[PDB]
Write a protein that binds this ligand. Structure first.
Ligand SMILES: *C(=C)C1=C(C)C(=O)N/C1=C\C1=NC(=C\c2[nH]c(/C=C3\NC(=O)C(C=C)=C3C)c(C)c2CCC(=O)O)/C(CCC(=O)O)=C1C
Lengths: 170, 161, 161, 170, 161, 170, 161, 170, 170, 161, 170, 161
């Protein structure tokens, strides 16, 4: 679901047209559309740096992860770890454009905790990485330079919720 | 299915972030949404009148539908209520398409299974085509709002033809 | 690959006419095109200056590239010409992306095979990242034209990182 | 290819940036974009009627096609025939949005003549059907009612070329 | 497709000679053929009467089909001829099924594409169901010949329902 | 299994030839074969009407099923519902020709209760539909008109058991 | 596998009701069943005599099988009992094929794995062919009952050749 | 096609019902059905012997085929050769039950000559094998012992044509 | 894993080079290599006899297995039973060449107990068969005739452990 | 198939150069080749004696093979020649396996199709097992040459068991 | 085929044992085995350098190949070109270990000329690249340093033939 | 992956016992193992010296790696430690390859993911190529031990080129 489909699905189950209030709320989402696109573009455009800097900071804080025997030791496991960070960032970016967390939940977060537990991936450490990405992604998305000045505080709170949702799920 | 979920699905299918092409696609939807939402508000506000008028248009064009005995016809109170209900379903689906910016709601809730239902219950697609044509002729929309409404009404007509 | 060919491909894959969603997607491109084409015209008009400056930015950041013997370095006339040529290729690809409204040209002509080439010929991705950063810092674009240019420059940087 | 990609492909093979003249031509295509979208929407929105009316007129003029032994006799062959009319209309509509015939040529028209010859499908009759669709599609696309008045003569000529290309190919 | 070609196809699919099961299946057809061929001869001998009567039965049940303007109706000489032609097609297909011992001829020549044709040309399946019911009620067959004819007529009715 | 195979399978596990009594029972099944074929033919020949009339009666009695939010609301769910009625009728007809319920149990009824529970399909309502089909199918199969008069009471009881088995399974 | 389960399987594979072709196939089995069941009753009533005689026919044709030391031969009490047991298995399988109207029982219980078993245990297919030929020559059946029995006996012989 | 379908296909292309004469011809085929089934059963029931004896006779007459370097030398090539003999016999038996050679032509004989030429399989030698099978198959099918006495001369001529068709095709 | 890989995997998890003591142990395995190859060759070269004689002895001791209704009754079940004996022997031979039981455990024995329980295969009887194969395989592998005389007692103990592991697993 | 072609095939299947593992594998073959080629030379030099003796060993073990009428037996001049020919084939195949360093020649030229041939022509695998055992007992090889010969002879015996 | 299989295949077609002379020739190939392995190892161990240096020299001599519009222009085409050089080197190395060109011919060179002609790949330029690889590969394989001194002239001639075969084929 | 597990895998993939070809392959490994294990012992005994020297060789060849600020460089204590650690990893992997007789350990623990890691962290493959070349030039091995070590070192160099 996107935010628009979510309301439609609820309405259909009730056999109802959307109300004027509901239509107005959707119009409001549209009016905030440029800002939402800027958020997605800024995060996407800085994706490699967001992931890499967060991963580097994670391994610096938790050196055990990379020492022999650690879960991110070997290039194959390191690559898988970097891939997971990117995957989470990617699905968070999808949730942002959608204005809804359903894609993040359904295709990424559902069952992930159990997947990690079965593999021996330290979920708590993934959450640290995710929270590091949250901070850098928001700082980038909300950068006042090179953009028409305006208020994106609501969007930044929403973006935060998606990152937090991911961190909680692991 | 919506313009946004289709963009996400395409990106995800290829294991990649949303492309600038896909952001432009979502912008395209946002730009069109003013006309779409205007059409939705109007059709909704006039729903009862459009539904009642559309049903009457069908009975007028196909007088036998009010006369012939049988559950498939509007020749009983139950049948007349079924018909108005169905026409209301079509109108409601059109408003949903306008709201999300694509045919997804109509495709999922109405078009999938349509041919089976119409054959099974002996309902004529042409009855519904007349109802849809009445709506086009009577919504009173103008400009791009009219274009949006008519695009989705025509999509339903194409599916029934 | 372009926004329009992607729309056509999606429709064709499903055996159907272009959807209203896909028409909105193409409209989205048309709306963005003013900014894209402005960026393309500007980058093109300033091409030689941007290419020369970008090459110098790389040599400045990585002085060894002008000094170390070897075909992979800009320490010979041939090497310096190869480097300026490559930077010109990147800039030209950016203008093509702006023109068609997506990364298709860069993906097909430059990114496919990139990692193999850079490893085979001992070229450092970081050299090209510096050249691209110079272009961002020196194109002098504003508003959405700057946004468009930087989006495609950043796409190349991401591929090199 | 679309019209934009076509110019880019030619330029890349020459190692050249697009010229200002070329950029201006592309800007002109963009400015005509609303009209082009209206053409595609109008044809799409009337697709069933365009195909069905053309097919009916074809069978009325060439009754042999539908008599026993005729190529469009049996419901399976009739359905295949109607499908082909729709397929051609669909690919013509793609060419319109692209401003380029390459998709029509590459995915539809190439080899079609030989395909029909091998099956015994009367290509000349398909061409009659295609030309009937051309006339009704253009009449619909160029309908002065219910649209901001303007000049679409160039577009209508272009649309004509795609239909003619299809008719020639069979 | 016939009882015999189905037996051959099953055997061939498994790279083996015809089984005793398949020979029994062919014997089953041969035994039933007396009734089938009797039905075929009778329906054929009475074809014009059955076709004319069936067409009239449809016009009687659905009077609008003789009145409403439009190519889909029997309200013109061309339309009345199309209708009688179609009913003749159905009857002829029934005789072919009787002759080969299965629905193969009807499946290939008539049922494949049926729903598309009826929707495209705005023909109501119910019109044809009435024609088929007239044939059942008027062929005058008895015993297993009647059973055979009615089995294939009912098969067509099921496809239209 | 069919009735013949069932006896053979039991005999093989015991390493025994069928007894004369067992052979006589099989001969009896063969002698009732014409009646059994008439039952299958009559049900098959009226399948669309049996399903449609039962479905219509079900929705008339349980209007909630078709109202917005109901399990048979939307054309996709309605089509799936009609399909399930047809599927059950089809497998019951197989059991009839076989003189054994194994195909009905193995390919249709096994796991169906749990399938419905997981989807939210109201199994109890499916059972109502199945019982409606039972009554109309038996009335059709046992119609005294247009058939050599004879006693089919045993067969009708057997047919009843298969429908009841299906209703119980949901 | 039986004529009836094969009919059901074909129908089910195609998501459809039993065809008239398949009902004719089942009728074909029912018609043949009188001869099949007569053959089954007779072979069963004469089983011990046929088994004993068949075993003796093999020992007569292949005298070494009674003489040569080794577990694969009928040169010990255990071996002679194994041989009579096996011949009994073949006869029993033939009666099962007659009962169900096809080779299913023989295919599942005996033919699947046959070549592996005969090679592994050094049993000669020709020994069993002689036993089967003895049964053909000594069952004393006539007409179609004899045809049915011989068809299944010959099927086993073909599998062993 | 079977013999029945062949007539129907020709009639459909002409839009005609079968004539009484045509129906009578089909009834005649049905009346000869028992004999036709006996032919198929007898050939099938003796298939291993028919193939093996023909192959043995072929290799005895053409020892080169089996000597080192010969096309039927090695167990893999010998097995392929025996398989081809069986395949041809099988498809001939299908043609017999069908009363039509179309299955034999379409699925077996079409392209076989060219297949053999490309592989180096001596087609002329295959034809010798096929003709040997023809003689033994007809002798078996037309054996006067253990069958209700009657005239099968027409059937034996027809069977001959199918074998000859196969031999010609290679 | 083979014996060499096992030590390497343990070392990598500790981030350590193999010690001289570990290297010497591997050199010792290499020096015993000819004997190990003889064991594998002798077992492989006598595989059909090992399996067949063990199976025959098993069925002689447990006649119920082969009587009608028994798990190894019917040629299909007998073939499956012989196949399982061969499969176990095969995987034991792999373990021997590897000097490690991991392939035997991972690809053969894991889940086998539960597989047999679900099918009704008497695991205890399979173990009897496996132990019979153990005795004949060791007798063959350790045969003093036709081989350079030497001490293989350590290898024979190791071979025994693999057979015992298989028997335990069922 | 040979040790070398198997190494090449494995490498090629993975799109890579020969591995050091594969070079070691080829070295392994080269080291074993002295014993293999010694065995091949010896068996070849003694071929007629081994073939004649092996045939006699079979006739001795299975006296009926010289007595019973039928094309499958060595009871005619043609049959005795066929038998000696076949035994010669087995010996020749063993020498080919020794030469290339694997069972490829035997697998391709002899084992593929073996079961079909033996069943079709009523040849007993046990006859060939005795011939092969005679060769093992009479080649007179020692050490690793004997090991090599016996490995391939045993491979054939396993295939026949 | 390898050199050993080649002789065996020829012998089998004649039904003959290998002669003592043939066996001696094979023994000679074995005795040269160490040298052959060194050649393969040396070429493999230097594969990246052999390909890259040859490609660089080719593009230096034929600058048109890499200029815009040239066949090796774009990174995708350059990668494909480098891949082809590696593929040819790889198959040549296979031919060396085999002592036979059949793998090179069958899996690589057959149809390559026509493949290149259809794509517009300049085969003559590929041949220049192949000949450059030949010279560097032989220089590396025949390097007198770091190896037991001996005569490899015959092997170097053989290696040359495989490279020449590849160059001719394009 | 090892020479032995590859042999087992090939056999298992084909449902068969180990072939004589595969036993020869394992023998080939056993024969080569003396040289491999000698190389492993030596490299291990000299590990610290080889690692320290290799790191210095890289810093000497590429002086900027000690000077330029950034986490990817050996211009900090952490960076210098990372570099020596990595070089130690390469050496350790080489010893593992020598021990098992193939590249399996290096492939699994180091080469899989290598290109991603080097691009992500801006590490130049050429740095590692110099370290590996230092090891080749300084291990002091002779004969086949040197050949074995250099084969695996060269394998790593090829992967980085
Ligand atoms: C030529 C073939 C044969 C020559 C030689 C011989 O003189 N008569 C020729 C065959 C005939 N068979 C006849 C009667 C007949 N055959 C069958 C066998 C089939 N029925 C099928 O259900 C089964 C398939 C599983 C086959 C096999 C049957 C049942 C009959 C009728 C009873 C009989 O007489 O035994 C005849 C007589 C003419 C006829 O009744 O059609 C000939 C001649």
């Amino acid at each position: 679901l996107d935010a628009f489909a979510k309301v439609v699905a609820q309405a259909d189950a009730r056999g109802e047209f959307l109300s004027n209030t509901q239509l107005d709320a959707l119009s409001k989402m549209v009016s905030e559309g440029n800002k939402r696109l800027d958020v997605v573009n800024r995060i996407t455009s800085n994706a490699s740096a967001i992931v890499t800097n967060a991963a580097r900071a994670l391994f610096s804080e938790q050196p055990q992860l990379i020492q022999p025997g650690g879960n991110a030791y070997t290039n194959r496991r390191m690559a898988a770890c970097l891939r997971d960070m990117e995957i989470i960032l990617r699905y968070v970016s999808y949730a942002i454009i959608a204005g809804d967390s359903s894609v993040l939940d359904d295709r990424c977060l559902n069952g992930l905790r159990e997947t990690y537990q079965a593999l021996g991936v330290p979920g708590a450490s993934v959450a640290v990485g995710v929270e590091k990405m949250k901070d850098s992604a928001i700082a980038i998305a909300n950068d006042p330079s090179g953009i028409t000045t305006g208020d994106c505080s609501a969007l930044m709170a929403e973006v935060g919720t998606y990152f937090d949702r991911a961190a909680t799920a692991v | 299915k919506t313009p946004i979920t289709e963009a996400i699905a395409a990106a995800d299918n290829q294991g990649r972030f949303l492309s600038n092409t896909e952001l432009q696609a979502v912008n395209g939807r946002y730009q069109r949404a003013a006309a779409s939402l205007e059409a939705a508000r109007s059709l909704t506000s006039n729903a009862q009148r459009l539904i009642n008028g559309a049903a009457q248009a069908v009975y007028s064009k196909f007088p036998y539908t009010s006369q012939m005995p049988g559950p498939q016809y509007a020749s009983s109170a139950v049948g007349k209520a079924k018909c108005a209900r169905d026409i209301g379903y079509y109108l409601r689906m059109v408003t949903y398409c306008l709201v999300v910016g694509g045919t997804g709601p109509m495709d999922e809730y109405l078009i999938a299974g349509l041919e089976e239902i119409n054959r099974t219950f002996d309902l004529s697609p042409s009855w519904y085509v007349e109802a849809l044509n009445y709506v086009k002729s009577n919504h009173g929309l103008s400009g791009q709002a009219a274009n949006e409404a008519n695009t989705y009404i025509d999509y339903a007509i194409n599916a029934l033809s």
